[PDB]
Each structure stands twice: as C-alpha cells, then as structure tokens.
Amino acid sequence: GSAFNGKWETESQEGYEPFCKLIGIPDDVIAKGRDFKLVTEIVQNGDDFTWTQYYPNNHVVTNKFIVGKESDMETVGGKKFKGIVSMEGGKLTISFPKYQQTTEISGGKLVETSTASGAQGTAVLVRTSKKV
Numbered sequence: 001g002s003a004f005n006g007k008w009e010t011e012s013q014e015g016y017e018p019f020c021k022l023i024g025i026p027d028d029v030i031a032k033g034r035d036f037k038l039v040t041e042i043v044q045n046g047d048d049f050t051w052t053q054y055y056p057n058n059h060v061v062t063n064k065f066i067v068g069k070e071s072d073m074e075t076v077g078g079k080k081f082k083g084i085v086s087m088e089g090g091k092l093t094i095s096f097p098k099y100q101q102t103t104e105i106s107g108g109k110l111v112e113t114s115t116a117s118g119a120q121g122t123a124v125l126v127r128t129s130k131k132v
C-alpha cells in the first residue's frame with residue numbers, strides 16, 4: 001500500500017461546529033479554529049503507518065501504528081492511550097465507545113470522517129485535505 005503517502009493540507013471542514021459543541025469545546029474556541037488549516041504528513045509501509053500532524057507554534061503530533069495490532073496513540077492535548085486500527089475497503093478505522101474515526105482517499109483527496117456520541121446525540125465531522 002502507498003495510497004496515503006505524502007503531504008496533505010486541510011481545504012474543508014463540514015460539521016465542524018456541531019462536532020466541537022458535542023465534545024465540549026466552547027464557542028469562542030470553535031470560532032478561533034474554523035479557518036485553521038492542518039498539514040498532515042503520512043509514511044505508509046504495508047501495515048505500518050507514521051502519521052504526522054503540524055499544529056500552530058511548532059507543535060507536532062506523530063502517531064505510529066500497525067494495522068490490527070495494539071498501538072500507542074497520541075493526542076494534541078498531549079494525552080496518551082492504546083488503540084487498534086482496522087483497514088477495511090481502503091479505509092483506516094478506529095472504533096470504541098462514543099467515537100469512530102475513518103480515513104480514506106476519495107477523489108484523490110484525504111477524507112477524515114469522525115463520529116462522536118454524547119447526551120446531545122451524535123455529531124459527524126468530515127475533514128477533507130488536498131495533496132500538497
């Protein structure tokens with residue numbers, strides 16, 4: 001597999017506001033981040049992925065995982081946990097209580113679909129990134 005390899009840049013976020021509300025991000029912070037454009041850098045070698053995300057102020061998040069094996073996950077908030085990612089129909093999926101993330105290439109583009117659950121219900125964010 002090589003489909004995911006390269007450098008990607010956010011071009012659209014659909015469902016951004018409802019998703020952010022559901023997960024408890026306050027209003028002024030939502031507005032402060034609607035036009036933020038994330039750069040994602042991916043190195044894929046078979047089942048091994050290195051997944052790098054560039055944030056403001058030289059802040060970087062790198063994830064490293066093998067499909068189907070328990071891996072160490074890392075977060076922008078500086079948190080850590082363990083998870084297991086499947087590869088199903090070209091789609092990378094992590095799934096657990098209250099949260100699902102899928103990432104695929106559709107129409108030559110990196111498409112990240114997140115689904116979070118809460119007391120308000122469920123919200124979906126679709127983030128699309130173009131190749132740079």
Ligand SMILES: C[C@H](CCC(=O)O)[C@H]1CC[C@H]2[C@@H]3[C@H](O)C[C@@H]4C[C@H](O)CC[C@]4(C)[C@H]3C[C@H](O)[C@]12C
Binds near residue numbers: 030114
């Ligand atoms: C608002 C802020 C941008 C700050 C700035 O531009 O100075 C951005 C940078 C990191 C962003 C977060 C990270 O990209 C991780 C999450 C990605 C989800 O798609 C939305 C919530 C999510 C939790 C984001 C909310 C918000 O847009 C953040 C916190």
Ligand SMILES: C[C@H](CCC(=O)O)[C@H]1CC[C@H]2[C@@H]3[C@H](O)C[C@@H]4C[C@H](O)CC[C@]4(C)[C@H]3C[C@H](O)[C@]12C
Binds near residue numbers: 063074092101103
């Ligand atoms: C849950 C967390 C959101 C925390 C945050 O940054 O705010 C996100 C940020 C980066 C995400 C990871 C990266 O997007 C790369 C992988 C993409 C796959 O679709 C799921 C597993 C995968 C390894 C993701 C799991 C999880 O959704 C992570 C770790």
Ligand SMILES: C[C@H](CCC(=O)O)[C@H]1CC[C@H]2[C@@H]3[C@H](O)C[C@@H]4C[C@H](O)CC[C@]4(C)[C@H]3C[C@H](O)[C@]12C
Binds near residue numbers: 076079
């Ligand atoms: C949702 C995300 C957690 C995901 C991650 O760990 O990357 C975190 C990263 C920084 C967090 C924010 C910061 O901790 C600062 C604020 C702290 C307040 O207690 C809640 C709102 C508040 C504005 C947070 C909302 C949300 O939990 C944010 C945006």
Ligand SMILES: C[C@H](CCC(=O)O)[C@H]1CC[C@H]2[C@@H]3[C@H](O)C[C@@H]4C[C@H](O)CC[C@]4(C)[C@H]3C[C@H](O)[C@]12C
Binds near residue numbers: 055056057059076077
């Ligand atoms: C923009 C917002 C506060 C709004 C304000 O300016 O008052 C701040 C509060 C908490 C901040 C976040 C937290 O400091 C956690 C992260 C710290 C990293 O150094 C940058 C991204 C990071 C995810 C931050 C992005 C952004 O600057 C947040 C979300």
Ligand SMILES: C[C@H](CCC(=O)O)[C@H]1CC[C@H]2[C@@H]3[C@H](O)C[C@@H]4C[C@H](O)CC[C@]4(C)[C@H]3C[C@H](O)[C@]12C
Binds near residue numbers: 075081098117
């Ligand atoms: C597991 C970790 C805390 C672990 C630690 O103390 O290191 C926590 C802190 C921020 C949490 C995330 C934030 O609360 C934002 C999301 C909220 C959704 O309800 C579940 C997934 C969601 C993406 C969370 C997954 C997980 O519970 C995170 C990543």
